[PDB]
Design an enzyme around this catalytic site. Structure first.
Site, PDB file in Angstrom:
ATOM      1  CG  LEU A 121     111.970 -56.820 -99.840  1.00 37.68           C
ATOM      2  CD1 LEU A 121     112.421 -57.761-100.918  1.00 37.68           C
ATOM      3  CD2 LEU A 121     111.369 -57.576 -98.647  1.00 37.68           C
ATOM      4  CD  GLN A 181     114.662 -66.235-102.686  1.00 36.59           C
ATOM      5  OE1 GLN A 181     114.210 -65.740-101.648  1.00 36.59           O
ATOM      6  NE2 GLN A 181     114.162 -67.344-103.223  1.00 36.59           N
ATOM      7  CG  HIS A 212     115.756 -61.319-100.611  1.00 39.16           C
ATOM      8  ND1 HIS A 212     115.400 -60.181 -99.916  1.00 39.16           N
ATOM      9  CD2 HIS A 212     114.927 -62.301-100.183  1.00 39.16           C
ATOM     10  CE1 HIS A 212     114.404 -60.467 -99.097  1.00 39.16           C
ATOM     11  NE2 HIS A 212     114.099 -61.748 -99.241  1.00 39.16           N
ATOM     12  CG  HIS A 228     112.675 -60.378-103.300  1.00 34.88           C
ATOM     13  ND1 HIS A 228     111.769 -59.674-104.063  1.00 34.88           N
ATOM     14  CD2 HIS A 228     111.997 -60.802-102.208  1.00 34.88           C
ATOM     15  CE1 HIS A 228     110.595 -59.671-103.458  1.00 34.88           C
ATOM     16  NE2 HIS A 228     110.705 -60.354-102.332  1.00 34.88           N
ATOM     17  CG  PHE A 253     104.019 -64.512-100.230  1.00 38.02           C
ATOM     18  CD1 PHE A 253     103.556 -63.296 -99.761  1.00 38.02           C
ATOM     19  CD2 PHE A 253     105.385 -64.722-100.270  1.00 38.02           C
ATOM     20  CE1 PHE A 253     104.434 -62.301 -99.347  1.00 38.02           C
ATOM     21  CE2 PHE A 253     106.269 -63.731 -99.866  1.00 38.02           C
ATOM     22  CZ  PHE A 253     105.791 -62.517 -99.402  1.00 38.02           C
TER      23      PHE A 253
HETATM   24  C1  LIG Z   1     116.720 -59.107 -96.097  1.00 39.25           C
HETATM   25  C2  LIG Z   1     115.253 -59.423 -95.973  1.00 39.25           C
HETATM   26  C3  LIG Z   1     114.911 -60.741 -95.717  1.00 39.25           C
HETATM   27  C4  LIG Z   1     113.575 -61.104 -95.615  1.00 39.25           C
HETATM   28  C5  LIG Z   1     112.539 -60.162 -95.758  1.00 39.25           C
HETATM   29  C6  LIG Z   1     112.894 -58.826 -95.997  1.00 39.25           C
HETATM   30  C7  LIG Z   1     114.235 -58.449 -96.125  1.00 39.25           C
HETATM   31  C8  LIG Z   1     114.586 -57.007 -96.399  1.00 39.25           C
HETATM   32  N1  LIG Z   1     111.223 -60.539 -95.636  1.00 39.25           N
HETATM   33  C9  LIG Z   1     110.920 -61.817 -95.366  1.00 39.25           C
HETATM   34  C10 LIG Z   1     109.584 -62.251 -95.227  1.00 39.25           C
HETATM   35  O1  LIG Z   1     108.655 -61.416 -95.328  1.00 39.25           O
HETATM   36  N2  LIG Z   1     109.287 -63.535 -94.971  1.00 39.25           N
HETATM   37  C11 LIG Z   1     110.300 -64.425 -94.857  1.00 39.25           C
HETATM   38  O2  LIG Z   1     110.049 -65.631 -94.616  1.00 39.25           O
HETATM   39  N3  LIG Z   1     111.597 -64.058 -94.979  1.00 39.25           N
HETATM   40  C12 LIG Z   1     111.919 -62.791 -95.220  1.00 39.25           C
HETATM   41  N4  LIG Z   1     113.255 -62.413 -95.354  1.00 39.25           N
HETATM   42  C13 LIG Z   1     114.329 -63.432 -95.191  1.00 39.25           C
HETATM   43  C14 LIG Z   1     114.471 -63.557 -93.670  1.00 39.25           C
HETATM   44  O3  LIG Z   1     114.082 -62.336 -93.023  1.00 39.25           O
HETATM   45  C15 LIG Z   1     115.887 -63.835 -93.202  1.00 39.25           C
HETATM   46  O4  LIG Z   1     116.441 -64.927 -93.943  1.00 39.25           O
HETATM   47  C16 LIG Z   1     115.879 -64.142 -91.713  1.00 39.25           C
HETATM   48  O5  LIG Z   1     115.234 -63.099 -90.967  1.00 39.25           O
HETATM   49  C17 LIG Z   1     117.279 -64.351 -91.164  1.00 39.25           C
HETATM   50  O6  LIG Z   1     117.060 -64.602 -89.783  1.00 39.25           O
HETATM   51  P1  LIG Z   1     118.196 -65.168 -88.810  1.00 39.25           P
HETATM   52  O7  LIG Z   1     117.615 -65.225 -87.416  1.00 39.25           O
HETATM   53  O8  LIG Z   1     118.850 -66.435 -89.324  1.00 39.25           O
HETATM   54  O9  LIG Z   1     119.357 -64.037 -88.875  1.00 39.25           O
HETATM   55  P2  LIG Z   1     119.328 -62.411 -88.897  1.00 39.25           P
HETATM   56  O10 LIG Z   1     118.001 -61.797 -88.478  1.00 39.25           O
HETATM   57  O11 LIG Z   1     120.005 -61.957 -90.176  1.00 39.25           O
HETATM   58  O12 LIG Z   1     120.287 -62.118 -87.662  1.00 39.25           O
HETATM   59  C18 LIG Z   1     121.662 -62.475 -87.598  1.00 39.25           C
HETATM   60  C19 LIG Z   1     121.917 -62.471 -86.103  1.00 39.25           C
HETATM   61  O13 LIG Z   1     123.201 -63.062 -85.924  1.00 39.25           O
HETATM   62  C20 LIG Z   1     124.041 -62.157 -85.213  1.00 39.25           C
HETATM   63  N5  LIG Z   1     125.458 -62.231 -85.650  1.00 39.25           N
HETATM   64  C21 LIG Z   1     125.917 -62.160 -86.915  1.00 39.25           C
HETATM   65  N6  LIG Z   1     127.278 -62.232 -86.897  1.00 39.25           N
HETATM   66  C22 LIG Z   1     127.641 -62.327 -85.600  1.00 39.25           C
HETATM   67  C23 LIG Z   1     128.936 -62.443 -84.911  1.00 39.25           C
HETATM   68  N7  LIG Z   1     130.107 -62.434 -85.597  1.00 39.25           N
HETATM   69  N8  LIG Z   1     128.932 -62.535 -83.572  1.00 39.25           N
HETATM   70  C24 LIG Z   1     127.762 -62.509 -82.928  1.00 39.25           C
HETATM   71  N9  LIG Z   1     126.567 -62.417 -83.475  1.00 39.25           N
HETATM   72  C25 LIG Z   1     126.490 -62.312 -84.821  1.00 39.25           C
HETATM   73  C26 LIG Z   1     123.488 -60.764 -85.502  1.00 39.25           C
HETATM   74  O14 LIG Z   1     123.699 -59.837 -84.424  1.00 39.25           O
HETATM   75  C27 LIG Z   1     122.006 -61.029 -85.625  1.00 39.25           C
HETATM   76  O15 LIG Z   1     121.489 -60.924 -84.309  1.00 39.25           O
HETATM   77  O1  LIG Z   2     112.066 -63.463 -98.345  1.00 35.58           O
HETATM   78  C1  LIG Z   2     110.818 -63.757 -98.178  1.00 35.58           C
HETATM   79  O2  LIG Z   2     110.403 -64.876 -97.780  1.00 35.58           O
HETATM   80  C2  LIG Z   2     109.800 -62.692 -98.509  1.00 35.58           C
HETATM   81  C3  LIG Z   2     110.093 -61.430 -98.785  1.00 35.58           C
HETATM   82  O3  LIG Z   2     111.403 -60.954 -98.810  1.00 35.58           O
HETATM   83  C4  LIG Z   2     108.986 -60.394 -99.110  1.00 35.58           C
HETATM   84  O4  LIG Z   2     108.450 -59.868 -98.122  1.00 35.58           O
HETATM   85  O5  LIG Z   2     108.691 -60.156-100.293  1.00 35.58           O
END
Ligand SMILES: *Cc1cc2c(cc1C)nc1c(=O)[nH]c(=O)nc-1n2C[C@H](O)[C@H](O)[C@H](O)COP(=O)(O)OP(=O)(O)OC[C@H]1O[C@@H](n2cnc3c(N)ncnc32)[C@H](O)[C@@H]1O
Ligand SMILES: O=C(O)/C=C(\O)C(=O)O
Ligand SMILES: CCCCCCCCCCCCCCCCCC(=O)OC[C@H](COP(=O)(O)OCCN)OC(=O)CCCCCCCCCCCCCCCCC
Ligand code: HEM
Ligand SMILES: CCCCCCCCCCCO[C@@H]1O[C@H](CO)[C@@H](O[C@H]2O[C@H](CO)[C@@H](O)[C@H](O)[C@H]2O)[C@H](O)[C@H]1O
Ligand SMILES: CC(C)=CCC/C(C)=C/CC/C(C)=C/Cc1c(O)c2ccccc2oc1=O
Ligand code: SF4
Ligand code: F3S
Ligand code: FES
Ligand SMILES: [K+]
Ligand SMILES: [K+]
Lengths: 611, 139, 239, 102
Positions: A253, A241, A354, A243, A120
């Site tokens: 993505l 960031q 991203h 991506h 990665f």
């Molecule tokens: C966008 C993305 C990110 C990503 C990825 C692929 C995509 C398409 N692949 C990844 C990967 O392979 N490896 C990795 O390390 N990271 C990867 N990312 C980034 C990562 O997924 C994200 O940064 C991360 O998952 C974010 O997680 P987090 O737990 O902080 O938050 P979330 O899943 O976005 O959920 C937000 C939660 O908060 C609740 N929420 C939001 N607003 C409110 C309000 N107003 N009131 C109550 N609750 C709220 C949402 O419901 C959700 O549950």
């Molecule tokens: O955000 C990350 O850490 C990784 C991704 O989005 C990915 O799966 O390419």
């Protein structure tokens, strides 16, 4: 006019993605009576869409050492990362990934039955000298889907009280301490105050300030904004960031796992251009460097497609069985959203917003901090973790597969710290009887807004403004115009127009609240960008091309005049917004360079950063 | 802090006393051949049972015995095309239910679940139902 | 311009005495994304911002936007708009569900049934939990393909007539396939107890192999086949 | 047993399969042994099958108890009449052959 329902818990977690789930049941598992308040059903959180995997130095493919992962992350962050939080995260990573497999996460496997790990972007052996690391543990290319479904299933074994499809509006603050949150129950249109000794903000990022992002529609910076409305600072919000590989069109993505399994980026003339930009790492350089590289190829006339506005991700030279086993998710998605067969033709891809590196600043224990007279001060009762936090483990640039690790590492950290600091059943603090009243006034104002600018139009003007003014490369004149356009759009929110006068499932209203929240994040992001007169990680200023540290780390430090804190940029941005005017104030606080244990893991001094 | 059983109970308690409408289903759902053939298996099964029960009731209740009724029928000198229709109509639901019953017994072994094979096996059930029915109505 | 008509189910809980109705909207396909969700968002942003539906990921991974489009349950975000302008696309909520508002159904019974099967790894000796990664061969992990990918969108279960008539007591195909996902996980020690939970007339045995579930699955999964494997395990397991 | 529901599903399948073999048997070896096997197998399979229809479509403890009780009566009268027909009349196999000669 709004019946308010009052609740009492030991702790309230806002957010049910990977970080909030881990914090919430971790708290319940320590005996704390815990509410989890989430605007989506938990498995719909953006974490479900994550693909490539989650880093941990398990050593299942070669001999590893978490200290190499520590180093990669520190160099990855371009020395804006706090090395104490990076120590904690990378040292905790093996136990955290193992915890997930023991919950039942269906990791891909090796011939030895252990968790399969892939290469990665930006990870190496022997402290940057040993070749490509293979420490990204994955469930094919659906790691986030399984991560979230496993954490959600595990959470069903505990007494955690879930409040699903409730929208948190603000924190309840008193004398600098958080006393809980106030929220709207979407299902029935009522207001709920959650009083609690500790509050954990895990609300995700705000990719939806831009016109093209990989993020869900629901990534609206909601917790970030509540922190800003509390008069607290956010940190490093200019560090967004890109991506390298969102699919052209819908912005979906396409995982960096494609390049980790062998895929390559090619331009219009069939060149594997990353061999020229980053001769060692190539297509596995850091994301800020790959995205800048792709962006250069397009603006220099080598864009692909009929418009010369993207480039190609090539996977078809790879064995079809490897694609089916390692990248089944993006194989479907390339067909649905591009009509591409990955075994025959490349995927059209371009850099796409991203991930947000900045957020609610915390310490390595997840506690939210403010900064007053040169000193960090914990905000009592208030924690943040996940993409909404700035610990800061990512600094100016996040390594792929480090966010999912951050979620589970710091989600648990928040729980562990509450348990070592507080006891269950302690008297929940009182609030004034009218606490949260202003949040309801704003909701009622938007619910009945009858101006000239409907919500969808104001959001569009924000996204196109951020897109063309706060992009991969930036300059002062263009950022300044983005600042001026954005402040005007913020004022023009006084002319907002909504149509749905209901209160049950009024997404016309809920999206107007999200707009207010995105606007606060975007104002902080672009005003911080204009002020930061250097280039570091994902923040590239073509009028200030050098990284500006307290020394020139390109030459020996012997005899150098250290630069005063106000004359260099190796410092975190602290942003505040006067929510009435929209005026952004900026301050700065030092990066933390000490690790948790110098003998166990040396602080890595800043250096030239090149892949 | 709610068990699943409590959650299901609150769902029904909340909803049955609500003003919420029930979204449409059978009146709006798109039919397929497997779906049509599934309900026809139930309909032909019920029909065959109600035919068996009526026959059984007539054996207990009618004052004459079967050979008298067959004689009465033949005495009407019905047209061979009408005899052929009645035989085809009697045998068709039995033939359908039988061949489709075999298909069900194959599914119960875990075979034939790929959606394209559900479709192949249904069309196969249709042609055998036709062939065996016309061959038997000719007898 | 290429005007396409959608006829969308409308019901407002905050209008007293409101009755469900269909409302037609006209969308120029040359100014719209290719998916039905793109048309729903375009209508909401531009014609009727009271139109209400669930959505998040817009790429078919979260499961939020499940609904009935042109007679079949699917995800609006991966369902291509039908460019035959002589046809109106009817859009309904997921079938036989209580409607909260417009296209938003109440999924909490569906979620409570998934909670009831304990969809998480269970070991008889759990005191080692956290020490070392459990070992699972490549072959035994391959048995999970087609099963773990479920997004819990409810498209399959709300397409099943057995779930329509007896959704209170029949777990339905989404939840039953997830039960089988844990039954055949080689790391799980509760296979017998998981089978034992379905020894009643309704939880599993309302499945009569209609196969609407497998037709409708936006992930191409086969919940109908997974149900048949449970049935075979039910009739073979000893205590 | 505690496995009542799986044993019932298996028994339903075994009776279906038995009834399927009786069709070749009736055509090849018609006679009293087949006639009564068809009487028993036809009544059992339809009793179980009609019970599944009741389970699917009938709701509420009283309507369920009434439908299932009416069905036992229907089934018990059905089997008696079929045995009646086999003993006092020409029996199932001969009747079918007689019908087809019309
Ligand atoms: C966008 C993305 C990110 C990503 C990825 C692929 C995509 C398409 N692949 C990844 C990967 O392979 N490896 C990795 O390390 N990271 C990867 N990312 C980034 C990562 O997924 C994200 O940064 C991360 O998952 C974010 O997680 P987090 O737990 O902080 O938050 P979330 O899943 O976005 O959920 C937000 C939660 O908060 C609740 N929420 C939001 N607003 C409110 C309000 N107003 N009131 C109550 N609750 C709220 C949402 O419901 C959700 O549950
Ligand atoms: O955000 C990350 O850490 C990784 C991704 O989005 C990915 O799966 O390419
Ligand atoms: C339904 C009505 C039953 C339909 C059965 C169709 C088969 C009729 C048939 O052709 O049987 C002929 C067979 C031999 O007689 P024949 O044709 O004269 O040939 C002489 C040389 N072998 O005659 C035989 O030996 C009989 C063998 C077949 C026995 C079939 C028993 C099962 C019937 C269950 C039917 C249930 C449905 C009842 C519905 C009608 C009620 C009103
Ligand atoms: C003479 C027959 C009669 C009167 C009869 C009647 C019935 C009835 C009433 C049902 C229940 C329908 C339902 O549950 O949908 C049924 C089901 C069934 N029958 Fe028959 N049947 C006959 C012959 C056969 C034969 C020859 C086979 C082979 C067969 C295979 C089946 C199967 C497999 C089922 C179960 C379908 C399911 O599980 O959904 N039947 N039959
Ligand atoms: C005893 C006889 C009982 C059965 C006969 C009753 C008549 C059946 C009428 C219902 C048939 O209805 C028809 O079925 C076919 C085949 O599944 C469907 O076609 C289906 O498969 C085709 C081909 O893979 C797909 O292109 C299509 O998207 C799908 O709907 C069609 O959309 C439906 O409209
Ligand atoms: C006699 C059947 C009458 C009845 C209540 C039918 C309900 C029903 C089904 O269970 C069904 C089963 C398979 C396929 C389509 C179906 O549609 C129905 O009408
Ligand atoms: S099996 Fe398919 S249709 Fe059913 S819930 Fe899962 S993903 Fe949705
Ligand atoms: S449609 Fe329903 S009856 Fe069974 S095969 Fe699927 S769960
Ligand atoms: S919006 Fe996530 S599945 Fe459609
Ligand atoms: K962050
Ligand atoms: K097992």
């Amino acid at each position: 006019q709004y019946p308010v329902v009052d609740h009492e818990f030991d702790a309230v977690v806002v957010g049910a993605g990977g970080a909030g789930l881990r914090a919430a049941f971790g708290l319940s598992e320590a005996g704390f009576n815990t509410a989890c308040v989430t605007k989506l059903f938990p498995t719909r959180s953006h974490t479900v869409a994550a693909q490539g995997g989650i880093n941990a130095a398990l050593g299942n493919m070669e001999d590893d050492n978490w200290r190499w992962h520590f180093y990669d992350t520190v160099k990855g962050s371009d020395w804006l990362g706090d090395q104490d939080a990076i120590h904690y995260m990378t040292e905790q990573a093996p136990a955290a990934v193992i915890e997930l497999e023991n919950y039942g996460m269906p990791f891909s496997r090796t011939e030895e039955g252990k968790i399969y790990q892939r290469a990665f972007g930006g990870q190496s052996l022997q402290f940057g000298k040993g070749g490509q690391a293979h420490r990204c543990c994955c469930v094919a290319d659906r790691t986030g889907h399984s991560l979230l479904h496993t954490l959600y299933g595990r959470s069903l074994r505990y007494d955690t009280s879930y409040f699903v499809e409730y929208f948190a509006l603000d924190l309840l603050m008193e004398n600098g301490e958080c006393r809980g949150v106030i929220a709207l129950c979407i299902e029935d249109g009522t207001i709920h105050r959650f009083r609690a000794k500790n509050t954990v903000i895990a609300t995700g990022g705000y990719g939806r300030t831009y016109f093209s992002c990989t993020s869900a529609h629901t990534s609206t910076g909601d917790g970030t904004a509540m922190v800003t409305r509390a008069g607290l600072p956010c940190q490093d919000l200019e560090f967004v960031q890109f991506h390298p590989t969102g699919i052209y069109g819908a912005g979906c993505l396409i995982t960096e796992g494609c390049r980790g399994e062998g895929g390559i980026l090619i331009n219009s003339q069939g060149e594997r251009f990353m061999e020229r930009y980053a001769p060692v790492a190539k297509d596995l350089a850091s994301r800020d460097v790959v995205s800048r590289s792709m962006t250069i190829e397009i603006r220099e006339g080598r864009g692909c497609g009929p418009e010369k506005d993207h480039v190609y991700l090539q996977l078809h030279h790879l064995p079809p069985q490897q694609l089916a086993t390692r990248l089944p998710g993006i194989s479907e998605t390339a067909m649905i959203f591009a009509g591409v067969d990955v075994t025959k033709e490349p995927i059209p891809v371009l850099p796409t917003v991203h991930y947000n590196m900045g957020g609610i600043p915390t310490n390595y224990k997840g506690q939210v901090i403010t900064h007053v007279n040169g000193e960090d001060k914990v905000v009592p009762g208030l924690y943040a973790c996940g993409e909404a936090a700035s610990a800061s483990v990512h600094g100016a640039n996040r390594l792929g597969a480090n966010s999912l690790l951050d979620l589970v590492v710091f989600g648990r950290a928040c729980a562990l710290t509450i348990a070592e600091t507080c006891k269950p059943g302690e008297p929940v603090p009182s609030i004034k009887p009218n606490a949260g009243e202003e949040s309801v006034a704003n909701l009622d104002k938007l619910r009945f807004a009858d101006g000239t600018i409907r919500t969808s139009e104001a959001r569009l003007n924000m996204q196109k403004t951020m897109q063309s003014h706060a992009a991969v490369f930036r300059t002062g004149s263009i950022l300044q115009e983005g600042c001026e356009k954005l402040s005007q759009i913020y004022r023009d929110l006084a002319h907002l127009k909504t149509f749905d006068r209901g209160i049950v499932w009024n997404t016309d209203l809920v999206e107007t609240l999200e707009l207010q929240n995105l606007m606060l994040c975007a104002l902080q992001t672009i005003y911080g960008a204009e002020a930061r007169k250097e280039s570091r990680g994902a923040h590239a200023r073509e009028d200030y091309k050098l990284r500006i540290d307290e020394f020139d780390y390109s030459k020996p430090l012997q005899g150098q005049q250290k630069r005063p804190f106000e004359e260099h940029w190796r410092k975190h941005t602290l942003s505040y917004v006067d929510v009435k005017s929209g005026k952004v104030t900026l301050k700065y606080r030092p990066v933390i360079d000490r690790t948790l244990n110098e003998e166990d893991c040396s602080s890595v001094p800043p250096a030239i950063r090149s892949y | 802090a709610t068990t699943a059983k409590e959650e299901m109970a609150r769902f029904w308690e909340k909803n049955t006393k609500s003003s919420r409408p029930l979204s449409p289903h059978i009146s709006i759902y798109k039919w397929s051949l497997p779906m049509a053939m599934s309900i026809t298996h139930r309909g032909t099964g019920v029909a065959l049972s109600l035919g068996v029960s009526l026959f059984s009731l007539a054996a207990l209740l009618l004052p004459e015995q079967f050979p008298h009724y067959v004689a009465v029928v033949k005495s009407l000198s019905l047209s061979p095309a009408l005899i052929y229709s009645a035989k085809f109509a009697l045998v068709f639901p039995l033939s359908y239910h039988t061949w489709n019953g075999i298909r069900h017994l194959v599914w119960d072994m875990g075979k034939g679940f790929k959606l394209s094979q559900v479709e192949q096996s249904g069309v196969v059930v249709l042609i055998l139902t036709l062939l065996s029915s016309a061959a038997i109505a000719a007898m | 311009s290429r005007i396409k008509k959608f006829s969308i189910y409308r019901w407002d809980p905050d209008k007293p005495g409101d009755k469900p109705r269909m409302q037609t909207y006209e969308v120029d396909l040359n100014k719209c994304g290719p998916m039905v969700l793109d048309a729903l968002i375009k209508i909401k942003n531009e014609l009727d911002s009271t139109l209400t539906f669930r959505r998040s990921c817009r790429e078919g991974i979260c499961g939020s936007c499940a609904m009935n489009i042109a007679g079949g349950n699917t995800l609006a975000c991966t369902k291509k708009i039908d460019p035959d302008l002589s046809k109106t696309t009817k859009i309904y909520p997921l079938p036989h569900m209580y409607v909260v508002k417009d296209l938003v159904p109440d999924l909490s019974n569906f979620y409570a049934q998934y909670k009831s099967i304990e969809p998480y790894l269970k070991k008889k000796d759990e005191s080692k939990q956290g020490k070392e990664q459990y070992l699972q061969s490549i072959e035994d992990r391959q048995k999970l393909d087609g099963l773990y990918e479920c997004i819990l969108c409810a498209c399959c279960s709300t397409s099943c007539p057995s779930y329509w008539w007896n959704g209170d007591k029949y777990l339905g195909p989404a939840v039953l396939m997830q039960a089988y996902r844990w039954m055949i996980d080689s790391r799980d020690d509760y296979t017998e107890e998981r089978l034992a939970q379905l020894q009643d007339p309704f939880s599993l045995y309302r499945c009569h192999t209609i196969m609407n579930c497998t037709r409708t699955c936006p992930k191409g999964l086969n919940p109908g086949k997974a149900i048949a494997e449970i049935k075979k395990m039910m009739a073979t397991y000893k205590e | 047993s505690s496995k009542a529901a799986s044993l019932h599903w298996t028994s339903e399948r075994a009776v279906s399969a038995l009834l399927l073999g009786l069709l070749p048997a009736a055509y090849l070896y018609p006679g009293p042994a087949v006639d009564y096997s068809l009487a028993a197998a036809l009544t059992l399979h339809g009793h179980w099958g009609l019970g599944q229809v009741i389970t699917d479509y009938v709701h509420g403890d009283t309507p369920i108890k009434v439908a299932n009780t009416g069905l036992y009566v229907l089934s018990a009268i059905t089997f008696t009449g079929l045995c009646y027909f086999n003993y006092y009349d020409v029996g199932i196999c001969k009747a079918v052959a007689m019908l087809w000669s019309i």
